[PDB]
């Protein structure tokens, strides 16, 4: 490919610096003998180390699209470019155009290339994944809709890369965005829209009958009742088949699903999760749990709670529609007190960054003989 | 030991390459003088760096037994073996059998050995702990019995090493396997075993009296009552002794334990945790909390909830009885959509792996002047 | 500064070793030509790598004050000191006092300095952040007051640095210390202080009327009622302004705050959080949520639950008043079974360390053809 051809060029540059003097001026080489060959062996082993490490840490697909340029990868690519161009420039001007003797020094030049390219690989692992290992900052990530909030520690990242780690943790950690869980507050605010003084109106409101407390208690009671119906239905559904007419787990799932289908439908409607689980999805997860020997409760934990975003179908999450709002340049590093917002189509992740505080530890000595207790009351 | 003797050989190989030419042919050395000694100093400092780093990252006990071979450690050991054997081969064939001059080049050969062995140490830290730093995958780990589920991010690991990290997080994160919390569903399914049409039977079931809702509400009420009794008992037990007859925390624990013992026994029976806490364990934790100045609630948090597996006795967890079920080779790396199962004696951890999605970020500019609000209703 | 001047000296040491032979004895240099210049280029590129990596990982402020000396940073500074002093000593004794020829060897000496100083940078990243990447231990951190407990995995750290990571996770993860949530147990124990036999007294206590169960149920009911009042108040407060008299979010916050202020005050009093939120803090967070387009529930999640310590004001947490109690030297590494206590002014973090167990994995083969199921009951 494009980067693979440049990788082939940067890998064959020391090999070309070795091979060209015995080809272009074969009879002009000084007799090296031992030291040149013992340096070729070190060259080959260091190139093997470089190829294995480059495969291990950089033969992987691009993980994300960021708004501005990855500053550290641009720095590494500019450094590799100026590195290899300066070595080819010195090799063409001061070695090939002069047709040098002392081939041992040419092999030393190629081995210094391999050494400094290994240190470029080391600077790459320093910049790309070791600079943010030490947790310099904390990040409070809050959804703007339901208020679900988790805290994360991050090192020195840019606002781009911090937003990337926040979105990774969003798909892993936050429950999935459900707009149907949000409509009750919207209709309640619109019902207030249907109809000094602002403190007296609040006093008349707080003295009135709280419909919301009793409706939430009654809804929680209905959810517990539908949950108990669902648990009984899924237990008496799983008891209908045996691990051993012979059938595969898909047909066993289709066999036992009509004895749980109505209770699950009523539970997903009362918990407002019915848009998240098609019948095909439930049958695939049912055959999955029947295959792996999972209990009714282990099958049912997918449906009892909300669950994170990566449980669900790949279209229900949408990672290409993320927008990064920031008051400053997103290539700037994190610092104390900045706010950046990760906007999806309906919700947003409001992220404010706080510096992890300077902590002062001190010892104090507790004598283990000073742990004496008396039967007297305290 | 076995690996320690090979470590002594790989550490003494550059030193032997240095020491053998002034011993075997002492009068044949060309006068090096400055450059050889300034290269010995660099050799000694790089060997000190190599010894300190090798102690820091590899002088540690083997952490786990895996089914197949650790592929990266086997690659590193084969690389070290071919490395050192090729250097001894070139040193015996082309240096010792020829009895070379230009000892400066021999010291350069030994320093190139020390350099490439430092880069072997670097390739070791690349392969063993840096390749999986960037979180390529997410892992949904579910117990097959109670359905408890947590999500974890992992990089490029094999299925072996991913299963190892999953088990680390199992002992840290999941509540302990309690088979007594699972018997109610089993007896309920056996009670259904005591006694078109499959949809009508489900309709008659869901219209019947849900015993399960009222039994769960009544059990939760009994657990709250026993919890309140236990809190009162442990508070009035801790008030009987004073931090200051003089006694150590073991005898103070034995003094105040009979005023809390029955309430704790009834709470551990109602929460089905009585097999997990012997009287010796409770007395040791009681003397522990009396020693460290912990409150009754801080003592009691060990017993109120289930708690993770590493709270409990070392025989109650059993890390040697883990079985890895996978449809493919466990030395293969993680990829999107694979399922592997970690089976203990009674339960299993069903782990399905999902690729963390390709995320596209973009900026959008919000003018901070565009945050103007009106008192008008919305 | 102090460390910046020593950094300038260690950076200019190879440059000084290069520049001094053409200045002090200019006419005595042997003609190097190609190889010396091709080694200067490698020197300049490796010094650029060293400067970029040193900026990336070590140009950062000191994060914490520890009781005893950081052992690994002291080892690194002693190593750099003996390193650079030994190189200046050999350069003064055996190069400057002799006024050497073969300047190519002097450039090789300076390049070996730059190489071994890059490996010092590598040993620094090995000791300071790579030795603890592999999770050797688990840590149960419990507050002595309310018993809140979380488990953390750590590698080979000292007790100092483990305590530092524990405090990082304390400010991120534990809910904030609230002494007002603890006074009910203290007054209940003092009420027991107002008034064989120790088992009969416990039997008479556990048979009595449990005031605590009914008071906790009644308090939870009052908290749910005040929460419903607060949700209604904040929704009907946010509906009073529109995103668009024109006003900024501070004045919009001040406009809509008197219609929610009494319900929020009553909720913070019933949940004992009123010392944590001044009116200025609530108005700043209100203007913050009005700015970022957050819902009433997203505004309200700061106040509904306790929340971690870093949500609150910077004086409410106090990172300078931490005391480390340990039975051994805090520079010793973690091992299985040690207990260290992190004491704040009122509470303490009791941390006991357990070794993560030796896990034995094995394969077992499940035939995917062996997943056959029958319609027969099990």
Coordinates of C-alpha atoms in Angstrom, one line a residue, chain C:
Chain C
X1 CA 16.3 26.0 37.5
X2 CA 18.2 23.4 39.5
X3 CA 17.3 20.4 37.5
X4 CA 17.2 22.4 34.3
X5 CA 20.8 23.4 34.6
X6 CA 21.9 19.8 35.2
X7 CA 19.8 18.8 32.2
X8 CA 21.6 21.5 30.1
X9 CA 24.9 20.0 31.3
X10 CA 24.0 16.4 30.5
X11 CA 22.7 17.6 27.1
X12 CA 25.8 19.7 26.3
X13 CA 28.3 17.0 27.6
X14 CA 28.4 15.1 24.2
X15 CA 28.5 18.5 22.3
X16 CA 31.4 19.6 24.5
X17 CA 33.2 16.3 23.9
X18 CA 32.8 17.0 20.2
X19 CA 33.8 20.7 20.2
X20 CA 36.8 20.7 22.5
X21 CA 39.4 18.7 20.3
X22 CA 39.1 21.0 17.3
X23 CA 39.4 24.0 19.6
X24 CA 42.2 23.0 22.0
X25 CA 44.4 21.1 19.5
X26 CA 43.1 22.1 16.0
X27 CA 46.2 21.2 14.0
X28 CA 46.6 17.8 15.7
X29 CA 43.4 16.1 14.3
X30 CA 43.8 13.3 12.0
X31 CA 41.8 13.8 8.8
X32 CA 38.4 12.0 9.4
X33 CA 36.3 13.3 6.5
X34 CA 33.4 11.1 5.8
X35 CA 33.0 8.8 8.8
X36 CA 33.2 11.5 11.5
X37 CA 30.5 13.6 9.7
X38 CA 28.2 10.6 9.2
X39 CA 28.6 9.9 12.9
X40 CA 27.9 13.6 13.8
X41 CA 24.6 13.2 11.9
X42 CA 23.6 10.1 13.9
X43 CA 24.7 11.9 17.1
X44 CA 22.4 14.9 16.3
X45 CA 19.5 12.7 15.5
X46 CA 19.9 10.6 18.6
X47 CA 20.2 13.8 20.7
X48 CA 17.0 15.1 19.1
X49 CA 15.3 11.8 20.0
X50 CA 16.6 12.1 23.6
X51 CA 15.4 15.7 24.0
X52 CA 11.9 14.9 22.6
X53 CA 11.5 11.8 24.8
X54 CA 12.9 13.7 27.9
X55 CA 10.4 16.5 27.3
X56 CA 7.6 14.0 26.7
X57 CA 8.1 11.9 29.9
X58 CA 10.0 14.1 32.4
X59 CA 9.2 17.7 31.7
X60 CA 6.3 17.7 34.1
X61 CA 5.7 18.9 37.7
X62 CA 6.3 16.8 40.8
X63 CA 3.0 15.1 41.5
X64 CA 3.2 14.1 45.1
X65 CA 5.2 14.4 48.3
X66 CA 6.1 11.0 49.8
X67 CA 7.4 10.2 53.3
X68 CA 10.7 8.6 52.4
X69 CA 12.8 8.9 49.2
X70 CA 11.5 7.8 45.8
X71 CA 14.0 4.8 45.5
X72 CA 13.9 4.5 41.8
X73 CA 14.2 8.2 41.0
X74 CA 17.2 8.3 43.5
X75 CA 18.7 5.3 41.7
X76 CA 18.2 7.1 38.3
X77 CA 19.8 10.3 39.5
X78 CA 22.7 8.5 41.2
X79 CA 23.1 6.6 37.9
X80 CA 23.1 9.7 35.8
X81 CA 25.5 11.4 38.2
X82 CA 28.1 8.5 38.2
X83 CA 27.5 8.2 34.4
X84 CA 28.3 11.8 33.5
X85 CA 31.1 12.1 36.2
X86 CA 32.8 9.0 34.9
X87 CA 32.6 10.2 31.3
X88 CA 34.0 13.7 32.2
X89 CA 36.7 11.9 34.3
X90 CA 37.8 9.7 31.4
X91 CA 37.6 12.7 29.0
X92 CA 39.8 14.9 31.3
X93 CA 42.3 12.3 32.3
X94 CA 42.8 10.2 29.2
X95 CA 41.8 12.6 26.3
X96 CA 42.4 16.2 27.4
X97 CA 45.5 15.6 29.4
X98 CA 47.0 13.4 26.6
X99 CA 45.7 15.7 23.7
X100 CA 44.7 12.7 21.6
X101 CA 44.8 12.1 17.9
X102 CA 42.2 9.9 16.0
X103 CA 39.2 12.3 16.4
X104 CA 36.9 9.7 14.9
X105 CA 37.4 7.7 18.1
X106 CA 36.5 10.8 20.1
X107 CA 33.3 11.1 18.1
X108 CA 32.7 7.4 18.8
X109 CA 33.1 8.1 22.5
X110 CA 30.5 10.9 22.3
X111 CA 28.1 8.8 20.3
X112 CA 28.5 6.0 22.9
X113 CA 27.6 8.6 25.5
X114 CA 24.5 9.5 23.6
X115 CA 23.6 5.9 23.2
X116 CA 24.0 5.0 26.8
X117 CA 22.1 8.1 27.8
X118 CA 19.2 7.0 25.6
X119 CA 19.4 3.7 27.4
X120 CA 19.3 5.6 30.7
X121 CA 16.1 7.2 29.5
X122 CA 14.8 3.7 28.6
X123 CA 15.8 2.4 32.1
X124 CA 13.9 5.4 33.5
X125 CA 10.7 4.5 31.7
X126 CA 11.3 0.8 32.8
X127 CA 11.6 1.7 36.5
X128 CA 9.1 4.5 36.8
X129 CA 6.1 3.4 34.8
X130 CA 6.6 -0.1 33.2
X131 CA 7.5 -2.2 36.3
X132 CA 3.9 -1.8 37.7
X133 CA 2.0 -2.4 34.4
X134 CA 1.5 -6.1 35.0
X135 CA -1.0 -6.4 37.9
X136 CA 0.8 -8.4 40.6
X137 CA -1.5 -7.5 43.5
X138 CA -5.0 -6.6 44.5
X139 CA -5.8 -3.9 47.0
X140 CA -8.9 -3.7 49.1
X141 CA -9.4 -0.1 50.2
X142 CA -12.0 0.5 52.9
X143 CA -13.0 3.7 54.6
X144 CA -13.0 3.2 58.4
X145 CA -16.2 5.4 58.8
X146 CA -18.9 4.3 56.3
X147 CA -17.2 1.1 55.0
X148 CA -17.2 2.1 51.3
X149 CA -14.8 -0.3 49.6
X150 CA -13.3 -0.8 46.2
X151 CA -10.7 -3.2 44.8
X152 CA -7.7 -2.1 42.7
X153 CA -5.1 -4.1 40.8
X154 CA -1.5 -2.9 41.1
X155 CA 1.9 -4.1 40.0
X156 CA 5.2 -4.0 41.8
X157 CA 5.0 -0.7 43.5
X158 CA 6.4 0.4 46.9
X159 CA 3.9 1.1 49.7
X160 CA 4.4 4.9 49.0
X161 CA 3.5 4.6 45.4
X162 CA 0.7 2.1 46.0
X163 CA -0.7 4.6 48.5
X164 CA -0.4 7.3 45.9
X165 CA -2.4 5.3 43.3
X166 CA -4.9 4.5 46.1
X167 CA -5.4 8.2 46.8
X168 CA -5.8 9.0 43.1
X169 CA -8.5 6.4 43.0
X170 CA -9.9 7.8 46.3
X171 CA -10.5 11.2 44.8
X172 CA -11.9 9.7 41.6
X173 CA -14.0 6.8 43.0
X174 CA -15.1 7.0 46.6
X175 CA -18.0 9.2 47.6
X176 CA -17.0 12.3 49.6
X177 CA -16.5 12.0 53.3
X178 CA -19.7 13.3 55.0
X179 CA -19.5 13.3 58.8
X180 CA -23.2 14.2 59.0
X181 CA -24.1 10.8 57.6
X182 CA -22.2 9.2 60.5
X183 CA -23.7 11.0 63.5
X184 CA -26.8 8.9 63.7
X185 CA -24.8 5.8 64.6
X186 CA -22.8 7.9 67.1
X187 CA -26.0 9.2 68.8
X188 CA -27.4 5.7 68.8
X189 CA -24.3 4.3 70.5
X190 CA -24.4 7.2 73.0
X191 CA -28.1 6.4 73.6
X192 CA -27.1 2.8 74.5
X193 CA -24.5 4.5 76.7
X194 CA -27.4 6.3 78.4
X195 CA -28.5 3.0 79.9
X196 CA -23.7 -15.0 80.1
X197 CA -25.6 -11.8 80.7
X198 CA -24.2 -10.3 77.5
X199 CA -26.0 -13.0 75.4
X200 CA -29.3 -12.5 77.3
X201 CA -29.0 -8.7 76.8
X202 CA -28.5 -9.3 73.1
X203 CA -31.5 -11.6 73.1
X204 CA -33.6 -8.9 74.8
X205 CA -32.4 -6.4 72.3
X206 CA -33.1 -8.5 69.2
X207 CA -36.6 -9.3 70.5
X208 CA -37.4 -5.6 71.0
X209 CA -38.9 -3.1 68.6
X210 CA -36.4 -2.3 65.9
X211 CA -36.7 1.5 65.7
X212 CA -33.9 1.5 63.1
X213 CA -35.8 -0.4 60.4
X214 CA -38.8 1.9 60.5
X215 CA -36.8 5.0 60.8
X216 CA -34.7 4.0 57.8
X217 CA -37.8 3.2 55.8
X218 CA -39.5 6.5 56.8
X219 CA -36.3 8.5 56.0
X220 CA -36.0 6.8 52.6
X221 CA -39.7 7.6 51.9
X222 CA -39.0 11.3 52.8
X223 CA -36.0 11.4 50.6
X224 CA -38.0 10.0 47.7
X225 CA -40.7 12.6 48.3
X226 CA -38.2 15.5 48.5
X227 CA -36.5 14.1 45.3
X228 CA -39.8 14.1 43.4
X229 CA -40.5 17.7 44.6
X230 CA -36.9 18.7 43.5
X231 CA -37.3 17.0 40.0
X232 CA -40.6 18.9 39.4
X233 CA -39.1 22.2 40.6
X234 CA -36.0 21.9 38.4
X235 CA -38.0 20.9 35.3
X236 CA -40.5 23.8 35.8
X237 CA -37.5 26.1 36.4
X238 CA -35.7 25.1 33.2
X239 CA -38.8 25.6 31.2
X240 CA -38.9 29.3 32.1
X241 CA -36.0 30.3 29.8
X242 CA -35.4 29.7 26.0
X243 CA -32.2 29.1 24.1
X244 CA -33.0 31.9 21.6
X245 CA -34.8 40.6 27.4
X246 CA -31.5 39.0 26.4
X247 CA -29.3 37.7 29.2
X248 CA -26.1 35.5 29.6
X249 CA -26.3 32.1 31.3
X250 CA -25.3 33.6 34.7
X251 CA -28.3 35.9 34.7
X252 CA -30.6 33.2 33.3
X253 CA -29.4 31.0 36.2
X254 CA -30.2 33.8 38.7
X255 CA -33.6 34.2 37.0
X256 CA -34.7 30.6 37.2
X257 CA -33.0 29.7 40.5
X258 CA -35.7 31.1 43.0
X259 CA -38.3 28.7 41.5
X260 CA -36.1 25.7 42.5
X261 CA -34.2 27.0 45.5
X262 CA -36.5 25.9 48.3
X263 CA -37.0 22.4 47.0
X264 CA -33.2 22.0 46.5
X265 CA -32.5 23.4 50.0
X266 CA -35.0 20.9 51.5
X267 CA -33.5 18.0 49.5
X268 CA -29.9 18.9 50.5
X269 CA -31.0 19.1 54.2
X270 CA -32.8 15.8 54.1
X271 CA -29.8 14.1 52.4
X272 CA -27.3 16.0 54.6
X273 CA -25.5 17.6 51.7
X274 CA -26.2 21.3 52.6
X275 CA -22.6 22.0 53.7
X276 CA -21.3 21.0 50.3
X277 CA -23.2 23.4 48.0
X278 CA -23.2 27.1 48.6
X279 CA -25.6 29.3 46.6
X280 CA -22.7 30.5 44.4
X281 CA -21.7 26.9 43.6
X282 CA -25.2 26.0 42.7
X283 CA -25.6 29.1 40.5
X284 CA -22.3 28.4 38.7
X285 CA -23.3 24.8 38.0
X286 CA -26.7 26.1 37.0
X287 CA -25.2 28.5 34.4
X288 CA -22.9 25.7 33.4
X289 CA -25.8 23.3 32.6
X290 CA -27.8 26.1 30.9
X291 CA -24.7 26.9 28.8
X292 CA -24.1 23.3 27.7
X293 CA -27.8 22.4 27.0
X294 CA -28.2 20.0 29.8
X295 CA -31.6 18.7 31.0
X296 CA -33.0 19.2 34.5
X297 CA -32.0 15.7 35.5
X298 CA -28.5 16.3 34.2
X299 CA -28.2 19.4 36.3
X300 CA -29.7 17.5 39.2
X301 CA -27.4 14.5 39.2
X302 CA -24.8 16.6 41.0
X303 CA -27.2 17.0 43.9
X304 CA -29.3 13.7 44.0
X305 CA -26.5 11.4 45.0
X306 CA -23.3 11.9 47.1
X307 CA -20.8 12.0 44.3
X308 CA -17.0 11.6 44.5
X309 CA -14.7 14.0 46.2
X310 CA -13.5 15.8 43.1
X311 CA -17.0 17.1 42.3
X312 CA -16.8 19.5 45.2
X313 CA -14.8 22.6 46.1
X314 CA -11.0 22.4 46.3
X315 CA -11.0 23.2 50.0
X316 CA -13.5 20.5 50.8
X317 CA -11.0 17.9 49.7
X318 CA -7.6 18.3 51.4
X319 CA -4.7 16.3 49.8
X320 CA -1.9 17.8 51.9
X321 CA -3.3 16.1 55.1
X322 CA -2.7 12.5 54.4
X323 CA -0.8 10.2 56.8
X324 CA 0.6 6.8 55.9
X325 CA 0.6 4.2 58.7
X326 CA 2.5 1.0 57.9
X327 CA 4.1 -1.7 60.1
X328 CA 7.2 -1.8 57.8
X329 CA 9.2 0.6 55.7
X330 CA 7.1 2.3 53.1
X331 CA 9.9 2.0 50.5
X332 CA 9.4 -1.8 50.6
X333 CA 7.4 -3.2 47.7
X334 CA 3.9 -4.6 48.0
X335 CA 3.6 -8.2 49.1
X336 CA 0.8 -10.6 50.0
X337 CA -0.9 -9.8 53.4
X338 CA 0.5 -6.4 54.3
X339 CA -1.8 -3.7 55.7
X340 CA -1.2 0.0 55.4
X341 CA -3.6 2.8 56.5
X342 CA -4.1 6.1 54.8
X343 CA -5.3 8.5 57.5
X344 CA -7.0 11.8 56.8
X345 CA -8.1 14.1 59.6
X346 CA -11.4 12.3 60.5
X347 CA -11.4 9.0 58.4
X348 CA -8.9 6.5 57.3
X349 CA -8.4 4.2 54.3
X350 CA -7.5 0.8 55.5
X351 CA -5.7 -1.0 52.7
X352 CA -4.8 -4.7 52.8
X353 CA -2.9 -6.2 49.9
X354 CA -3.5 -9.7 48.5
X355 CA -1.4 -11.4 45.8
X356 CA -3.4 -12.1 42.7
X357 CA -3.6 -15.9 42.7
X358 CA -1.7 -18.3 40.5
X359 CA -4.2 -19.4 37.8
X360 CA -4.0 -22.6 35.9
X361 CA -5.8 -22.7 32.6
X362 CA -6.5 -25.7 30.5
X363 CA -8.4 -26.4 27.3
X364 CA -11.3 -28.7 27.0
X365 CA -12.8 -29.4 23.6
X366 CA -16.5 -29.0 23.1
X367 CA -17.7 -30.4 19.8
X368 CA -20.1 -27.8 18.2
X369 CA -21.9 -30.9 16.9
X370 CA -22.6 -31.8 20.6
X371 CA -25.0 -28.9 21.1
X372 CA -28.0 -31.1 20.1
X373 CA -31.2 -30.5 22.1
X374 CA -34.5 -32.4 22.5
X375 CA -38.0 -31.2 23.1
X376 CA -38.2 -33.6 26.1
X377 CA -38.4 -32.0 29.5
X378 CA -35.3 -31.9 31.8

